[PDB]
């Protein structure tokens, strides 16, 4: 009856902050940076090819050891192996049977999964021989999980199908806090390098930032004509990259409210599934639906490298923090480790 007037009040101030970010209104960085040289051609070849699975795989995550990979197959196997001797170190069954995400530990101790059934299950791997005991099971949802990230050995952060986000502690078994106020459903998130923030992307391209101690919202970033699927940031905490389902990888800065760089290309037509920066940040790594992990530069918007590892679609990838290697995950059980 009266909230239409609230919408009409909101529209002009939305335009006001639109022209407020058009107050500076400088272009992207390729318009100013004419002095720099291109990175030149860069080529990688397969050093080791993993093996052992049967199903499709969804996600992975490098450890802080820079030696251990975990992965989540569709049947229910959660595998955790090395990348030196190429031999499996553990093999975990699931009380459920689905996965959609994984997470390792910054202490390098124990892992966490949980899929379509609305459960985060944290599995201890420290003192048990062989098949390890389910350490804790954390409910508190009515929608599918999407990504989990460890921020210490104590608290986890999760982002579910119930259009929420939640920060939990695991030796008490309840939510410490919520992060609500999000229209579409969330899809991914990633933990800021000083355990303070995480950026959160959703259905309606509304990439929003949060802070943990205050527990409220900070900012908005809307720059895509469609849905997004994966986000991460630069390792020194200034800027975050975003990839959508219409080949519109873009890059924003945390204190500018502006599309700092678009990495679009005229040939590519199908969406992405994951994006992660390298250690230096000279190049952006990405994986698309046409079977290719084609790698962009990060400075002058060129298809730097093209690598076709395998026949199906890539699912997720992610670099190691020391930057010596790159892992990628297929849709047909082959876990390639590019260099």
């Amino acid at each position: 009856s009266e909230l239409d007037q609230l919408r009409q009040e909101a529209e002009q101030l939305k335009n006001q902050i639109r022209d407020a970010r058009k107050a500076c209104a400088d272009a992207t960085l390729s318009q100013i940076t004419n002095n720099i040289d291109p990175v030149g051609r860069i080529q990688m070849r397969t050093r080791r090819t993993l093996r052992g699975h049967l199903a499709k795989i969804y996600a992975m995550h490098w450890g802080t050891d820079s030696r251990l990979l975990l992965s989540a197959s569709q049947d229910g196997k959660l595998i955790i192996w090395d990348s030196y001797t190429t031999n499996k170190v553990h093999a975990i069954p699931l009380r459920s049977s689905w996965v959609m995400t994984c997470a390792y530990a910054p202490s390098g101790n124990y892992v966490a999964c949980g899929g379509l059934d609305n459960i985060c299950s944290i599995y201890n791997l420290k003192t048990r021989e062989g098949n390890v005991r389910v350490s804790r099971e954390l409910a508190g949802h009515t929608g599918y999980l999407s990504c989990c990230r460890f921020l210490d050995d104590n608290q986890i952060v999760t982002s579910s199908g119930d259009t929420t986000c939640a920060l939990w502690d695991i030796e008490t078994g309840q939510q410490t806090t919520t992060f609500t106020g999000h229209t579409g459903d969330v899809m991914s998130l990633s933990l800021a390098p000083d355990t303070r923030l995480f950026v959160s992307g959703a259905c309606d391209a509304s990439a929003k930032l949060w802070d943990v101690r205050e527990g409220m919202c900070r900012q908005t970033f809307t720059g895509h004509e469609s849905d997004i699927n994966a986000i991460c940031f630069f390792p020194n905490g200034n800027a975050f990259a975003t990839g959508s389902d219409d080949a519109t990888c873009r890059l924003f800065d945390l204190r500018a409210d502006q599309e700092l760089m678009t990495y679009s290309h005229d040939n590519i037509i199908c969406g992405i599934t994951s994006v992660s920066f390298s250690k230096s940040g000279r190049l952006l790594l990405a994986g698309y639906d046409d079977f290719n992990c084609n790698v962009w530069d990060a400075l002058k918007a060129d298809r730097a490298g093209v690598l076709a590892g395998h026949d199906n679609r890539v699912s997720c990838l992610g670099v190691t923090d020391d930057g010596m290697a790159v892992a990628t995950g297929s849709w047909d059980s082959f876990l390639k480790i590019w260099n």
Binding site: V89, M100, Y144, D185
Partner: protein, 223 residues
């Protein structure tokens, strides 16, 4: 070489469980509303022997089944249904008493146009095109209450032109099977049932043995 021998033992265990897992027929159930899910899940598990997804498991006549449910985690549909491609038999459900359902949650929505709007969103959906559909339709005794007038031209235009059970139920089944694309080779094996019936698991077994003999020949290339 203790680490290597440990990994070899784990590898043998993994492949053993994989070849154990391979001999099942993973079915997928779905269907909106109060469309007989309770009846079709009671009449499957235990009658023969006298908030996530609910995995009920049954076995009959030397073939061990497994079916899932999507009824408790409603969200954006187009993002998790790709994780079910490769199942064999998408069991549908529809209610034949849908003519009298004036609403569910809105002010004016017939149940028949809802389930038709759900059923079109699967057979054309590009993740489900080489997987057949074993349709069902139940609550037929309430559909036997069409002897009192309740004309079929309320949820349709004037098409059936009759009142008894023998002509009306033939009209609804054609109304589903005409919305099928018949894009690639798949075919829809309809049926009819009620609450106090039995042995319709014989029907779904005789159906699923026809997406094995019909399917294995494609791999040998014979058919």
């Amino acid at each position: 070489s203790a680490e290597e021998k440990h990994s070899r033992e784990l590898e043998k265990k993994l492949k053993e469980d994989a070849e154990k897992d391979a001999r099942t027929v993973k079915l997928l159930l779905l269907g909106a509303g109060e469309s007989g899910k309770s009846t079709i899940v009671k009449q499957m598990k235990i009658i023969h022997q006298d908030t996530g997804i609910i995995e009920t498991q049954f076995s009959f006549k030397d073939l061990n089944f497994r079916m899932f449910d999507v009824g408790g985690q409603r969200s954006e549909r187009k993002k998790w249904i790709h994780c079910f491609e490769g199942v064999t038999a998408i069991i549908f459900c529809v209610a034949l008493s849908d003519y009298d359902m004036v609403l569910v949650e809105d002010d004016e929505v017939n149940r028949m146009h809802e389930s038709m709007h759900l059923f079109n969103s699967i057979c054309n959906n590009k993740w489900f095109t080489d997987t057949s559909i074993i349709l069902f339709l139940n609550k037929k005794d309430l559909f036997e209450e069409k002897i009192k007038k309740s004309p079929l031209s309320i949820c349709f235009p004037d098409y059936a032109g009759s009142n008894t059970y023998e002509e009306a139920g033939n009209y609804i089944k054609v109304q589903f099977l005409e919305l099928n694309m018949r894009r690639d080779v798949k075919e829809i094996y309809s049926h009819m049932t009620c609450a106090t019936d039995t042995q319709n698991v014989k029907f779904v077994f005789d159906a699923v043995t026809d997406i094995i003999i019909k399917e294995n020949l494609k791999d040998c290339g014979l058919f």
